Design a protein around this nucleic acid. Structure first.
Ligand SMILES: [Mg+2]
Ligand SMILES: [Mg+2]
Ligand SMILES: [Mg+2]
Ligand SMILES: [Mg+2]
Ligand SMILES: [Mg+2]
Ligand SMILES: [Mg+2]
Ligand SMILES: [Mg+2]
Ligand SMILES: [Mg+2]
Ligand SMILES: [Mg+2]
Ligand SMILES: [Mg+2]
Ligand SMILES: [Mg+2]
Ligand SMILES: [Mg+2]
Ligand SMILES: [Mg+2]
Ligand SMILES: [Mg+2]
Ligand SMILES: [Mg+2]
Ligand SMILES: [Mg+2]
Ligand SMILES: [Mg+2]
Lengths: 124, 97, 206, 46, 152, 176, 41, 26
RNA sequence: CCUCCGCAUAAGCCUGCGUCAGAUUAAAACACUGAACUGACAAUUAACAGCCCAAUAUCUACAAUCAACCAACAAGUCAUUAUUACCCUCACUGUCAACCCAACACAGGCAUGCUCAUAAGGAAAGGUUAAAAAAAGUAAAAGGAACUCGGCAAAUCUUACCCC
RNA sequence: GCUACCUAAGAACAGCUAAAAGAGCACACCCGUCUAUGUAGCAAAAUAGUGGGAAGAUUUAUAGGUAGAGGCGACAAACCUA
RNA sequence: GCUAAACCUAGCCCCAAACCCACUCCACCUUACUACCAGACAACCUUAGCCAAACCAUUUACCCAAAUAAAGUAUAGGCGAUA
């Protein structure tokens, strides 16, 4: 009979089965009437590579460096080191108003911008 | 060949165990405890046979009666089939009828 | 580096990843497990590098330094004391080079030694009120120190020089992070000056 | 004549006859898959 | 990137950008003879020709003229001691052709070694073994088996 | 250039490359996001060169000079990814009060099990999505007996495990 | 297997020691040795 | 294995007797 | 010396006689080292083939058979227009083998194209002897179905009659 | 996925005589009359020869349909995975 | 003296107690393990028979309240097997 245990891949079926299965690559366009493949430039992941000419940070570390107690970053710590000083200053000055938290870094809805956080618009 | 070629390891038995030394204690508790407790209530074991001897068919019937509602499905199917078979055997087959 | 051993695997004086250990215990092997005393991580006193005293064996009463600790079988290998002799260079026409080789010892077979009088002594783990946690002798009551041993890194930190691919301590510890409510994507976009003006639009998640 | 070659393989027929979708398309096939899962089979279908 | 969810592109939407890519490639020595401008890579399954071209020209600044790809099927023939088939992973290989007339020959990495530094952990025991071997190979057929140890 | 897929030509066939100290999660948290990005690409190039060297050593049938370099790089990039993910998770919790940046739902599939179904960002609404409306997220309770059977199988395995633990403890105490 | 037979060898030898001087397979094989020893006795 | 000690002791005695028969001491 | 083969595609199968090492062992129906193998390494690169198409109405009587005369019946295998919408492009997958279905390295089964004996592809004899019986052939005096249930088989080419 | 029948959309049929053809000889191809071998066989139905058909009620690849108190059957109590 | 022989411990069984499980990332109802498109169909239903009645034709314990006892009693039933 047929091999039940081997993983079903793109090499195994008839001619129609081949070419439909794929290997996990993500599509970058569509097929038109003449079987012509239209590529979309925006559907192709553009690699964001920085400049490394003046970058003094090697892929290893020196052994002479000293250890430190680990402390995973939390939302509370980020708030304390991000918004707490400014809001403390503008509350001590008496200008803090609870209604408009926007000028402290908060935003009501996440639809308006490009890199929205909860649905994770971006890639990586 | 069937016999072991060596002597089995010597099995020491502690006759003055806690359990062996205290075996039988608090028996006769009804006789000399003003019958507040029965010796059958010192028995530990299955819920369907504590203070009860019974046959094998009787044991199966009693187990299905007392604990057969919280049994596993395959175990209860096995019990039902065993009760059926035992009924047939003890009621239709054998000498002495 | 990450190899899982069978549930009943014998630890046999060779590392699990060694060729000799692979030869001795192939994946097809099944044999009766050795049952060892259960000792927690907070009462194992003898560490790799201290001097112990052998209570009994072929040599009883001689002092020695432990060279390897196998916690999976309660084993401490004493340096060149509880030894038997074997050949290492083996050919079909000449074999020689008989060497002494140590055999493992259980932890009741050895006892710890304190540097004052060089005598066997029992150790109790008394929690010091200064914060650290060390061993204490019973009969006399001294602080037996944790011995200094080379680490598993195979390095000495004092005679260490930075390589061409090792980042120095100063620029490895220099803090360049300023906490902010912006993601890595926004920060790199603005730092590298990538301008995106068209907006992402509503998508149906289900 | 000779009658050992009753199997004439074809992936289309195999996947159409004993595939996952064909199993799940009927309550009886769903119970077939459930029986396979209960027994611990490595392959629940073709 | 791999093992990640791609944002769904809608017409007129922004450019899909990856900032910390998840693709790692190997520069492999060809097993057959190839043109001088052909460089052979071993790339993950999810990588495409456009992905590899952009990878090469963005990370290594390598000018690329052509990319072709294929999938090599790993063998599923080896049996375990339990008669269970062991599967060598299928992989993807890419043939890239350089752009502006550049050529590439795979380097010879391993030759040549010449070192004679002092050693104690292993070289001392090697001196052990060598000296014992050079001193203890003095057998004599004229003796017929009598041990050549006693002075008498 | 293509020479970045290999190390310094002086190290070719030298049997040892004395370097270590993979990046620590704390040390990476100490850095900023642009530095993290640049260091990620540095580590990426180093990892690519190490993978190339490992494959070439396998082909030549020679041991890899210092294989622990690959492990150090791999765990350093893992720590960097951890740091970036931690910052992102904190920011998402702060702004929307959510974890699991991939939306989903606890559902109950055709076999009666409880699964966490992750969403799939379609372009048309689900009520006219034809393929989606063919998946069945409900029981049809001819599966309840199978659910009970699986539960009983799990109970049997757990009981065997506990009993074996008891027996092993008894043997250990019997000797010691 | 509660209390299976352990000393079957000694019973086999009890029968077989009276067959040692026989000829064929009946001096070693119990199934034939027992019959021939019964006839001999 | 078969649980027990009597058959094992009997067989050990038989083996000792056979060894004595095969290699009688002076 | 044989070739009634072969080379491709489809389908099927899924690394299954490529290299190196072990060949002390192990399958080779024996062996050298390679089809009844162990480990490592290496390869099948698209133009061929798969993977297609924006709607709403509307159009579509006249076979094929060299399609020309003629001739038919069983009556047939191929077509648009009108208006709106639309200016980005060459991705992904198959590509190996002495191979599949028959428990086998099985005298069996297996679609299409191409030359129909080849430019493909192959080897009936491990060595010897020259008994019987057996199998497959070849030749046979005189006779020519006398054989046998029956001209079965073989060799020659064959007339007439009957039943269904 | 064998086989019985059907549905969709395909393919094949040299040469000669062509009477015009469910015509004749005759390949490929389909079938299996008779003989011999084989009978734990090459083969759980084969081989060699000899035969019936071979432009049709033909053969055949692919996908689909009908299922057991049933299906399908140019009724053999046929076939529906030896 | 070859082939062999021998061995304890992996685990399991029956109880008791206690109500038990399941998202690292990615993929998976289409030809499952497939990133990405316009008919929205949908489940709810008295088991039967073997067997016993020495054939069989009405009938023939098996269902989910701790025990025990009433009691194999009242009753049912080709008034019979049995219930
Ligand atoms: Mg080819
Ligand atoms: Mg066969
Ligand atoms: Mg040739
Ligand atoms: Mg030959
Ligand atoms: Mg001959
Ligand atoms: Mg011969
Ligand atoms: Mg003649
Ligand atoms: Mg006659
Ligand atoms: Mg006659
Ligand atoms: Mg004839
Ligand atoms: Mg005709
Ligand atoms: Mg004809
Ligand atoms: Mg008739
Ligand atoms: Mg009839
Ligand atoms: Mg009856
Ligand atoms: Mg009867
Ligand atoms: Mg009858």
């Amino acid at each position: 009979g047929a091999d039940r245990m081997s993983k079903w891949t793109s090499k195994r079926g008839p001619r129609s089965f081949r070419g439909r299965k794929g290997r996990g690559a993500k599509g970058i366009g569509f097929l038109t009437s003449g079987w012509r493949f239209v590529q979309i430039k925006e559907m192709v992941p553009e690699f964001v590579v920085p400049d490394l000419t003046g970058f003094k940070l090697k892929p290893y570390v020196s052994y002479l460096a000293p250890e430190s107690e680990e402390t995973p970053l939390t939302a509370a710590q980020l708030f304390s080191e991000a918004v707490a000083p400014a809001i403390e200053k503008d509350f001590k000055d008496g200008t803090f108003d609870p209604d408009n938290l926007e000028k402290y870094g908060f935003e009501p809805t996440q639809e308006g911008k490009l890199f929205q956080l909860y649905p994770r618009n971006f890639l990586r | 060949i069937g016999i072991r070629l060596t002597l089995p390891p010597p099995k020491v038995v502690d006759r003055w165990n806690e359990k062996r030394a205290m075996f039988g204690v608090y028996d006769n508790i009804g006789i000399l405890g003003n019958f507040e407790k029965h010796p059958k209530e010192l028995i530990r074991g299955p819920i369907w046979l504590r203070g009860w001897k019974g046959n094998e068919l009787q044991r199966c019937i009693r187990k299905r009666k007392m604990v057969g509602s919280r049994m596993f499905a395959d175990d209860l199917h096995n019990l039902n089939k065993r009760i059926r078979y035992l009924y047939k055997h003890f009621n239709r087959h054998g000498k002495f009828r | 580096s990450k190899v899982t051993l069978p549930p009943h695997y014998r630890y046999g004086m060779s590392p699990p990843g060694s060729v000799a250990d692979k030869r001795k215990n192939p994946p097809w092997i099944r044999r009766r497990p050795v049952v060892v005393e259960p000792i927690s991580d907070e009462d194992w006193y003898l560490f790799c590098g201290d001097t112990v005293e052998i209570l009994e064996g072929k040599d009883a009463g001689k002092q020695g330094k432990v060279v390897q600790v196998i916690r999976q079988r309660n084993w401490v290998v004493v340096g060149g004391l509880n030894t038997h002799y074997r050949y290492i260079g083996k050919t079909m026409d000449y074999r020689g080079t008989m060497i002494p080789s140590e055999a493992p010892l259980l932890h009741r077979q050895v006892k710890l030694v304190d540097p004052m009088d060089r005598k066997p002594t029992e150790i109790e783990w008394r929690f010091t009120e200064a914060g650290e946690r060390v061993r204490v002798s019973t009969r006399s009551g001294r602080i037996i120190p944790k011995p200094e041993f080379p680490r598993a890194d195979g390095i000495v930190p004092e005679t260490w020089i930075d390589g061409p691919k090792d980042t120095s301590v100063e620029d490895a510890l220099e803090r360049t992070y300023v906490p902010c409510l912006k993601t890595l994507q926004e920060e790199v976009m603005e730092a590298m000056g990538i301008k995106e003006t068209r907006k992402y639009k509503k998508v149906y998640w289900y | 004549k000779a009658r050992g070659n009753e199997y004439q393989p074809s992936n289309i027929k195999r996947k159409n006859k004993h595939g996952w979708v064909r199993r799940l398309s009927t309550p009886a096939g769903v119970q077939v898959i459930l029986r396979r899962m209960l027994k611990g089979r490595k392959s629940l279908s073709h | 990137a791999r093992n990640v969810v791609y944002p769904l592109y809608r017409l007129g939407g922004p450019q899909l950008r990856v900032f910390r890519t998840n693709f790692f490639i190997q520069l492999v020595r060809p097993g057959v003879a190839q043109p001088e401008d052909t460089v052979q890579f071993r790339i993950p399954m999810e990588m495409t020709r456009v992905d590899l071209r952009n990878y090469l020209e963005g990370i290594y600044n390598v000018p690329v003229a052509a990319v072709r790809t294929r999938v090599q099927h790993g063998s599923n023939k080896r049996r375990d001691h339990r008669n269970v088939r062991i599967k060598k992973p299928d992989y993807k290989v890419a043939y890239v052709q350089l752009a502006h007339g550049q050529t590439f020959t795979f380097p010879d990495l391993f030759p040549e070694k010449d070192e004679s530094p002092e050693g104690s952990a292993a070289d001392d025991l090697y001196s052990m073994l060598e000296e014992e071997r050079q001193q203890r190979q003095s057998s004599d057929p004229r003796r017929g088996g009598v041990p050549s140890w006693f002075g008498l | 250039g293509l020479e970045e897929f290999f190390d310094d030509p002086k190290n070719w066939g030298q049997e040892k490359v004395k370097s270590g100290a993979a990046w620590t999660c704390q040390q990476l948290r100490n850095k900023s996001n642009e530095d993290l990005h640049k260091l990620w690409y540095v580590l990426l190039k180093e990892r690519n060169m190490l993978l190339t060297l490992e494959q070439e050593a396998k082909r030549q049938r020679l041991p890899m000079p210092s294989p622990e370099r690959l492990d150090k790089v791999v765990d350093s990039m893992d720590a960097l990814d951890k740091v970036v993910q931690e910052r992102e998770d904190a920011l998402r919790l702060l702004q929307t009060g959510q974890e699991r940046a991939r939306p989903g739902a606890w559902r109950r599939d055709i076999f009666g099990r409880i699964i966490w179904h992750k969403f799939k960002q379609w372009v048309i609404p689900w009520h006219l999505n034809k393929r989606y409306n063919r998946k069945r997220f409900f029981a049809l309770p001819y599966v309840d007996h199978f659910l009970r059977l699986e539960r009983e199988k799990r109970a049997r395995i757990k009981a065997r495990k506990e009993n074996l633990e008891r027996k092993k403890a008894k043997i250990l105490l019997k000797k010691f | 297997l509660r209390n299976r037979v352990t000393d079957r060898y000694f019973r086999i030898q009890e029968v077989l020691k009276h067959a040692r001087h026989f000829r064929g397979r009946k001096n070693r094989c119990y199934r034939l040795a027992v019959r021939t020893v019964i006839r001999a006795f | 294995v078969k649980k027990g000690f009597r058959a094992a002791f009997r067989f050990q005695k038989e083996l000792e007797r056979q060894r004595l028969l095969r290699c009688p001491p002076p």
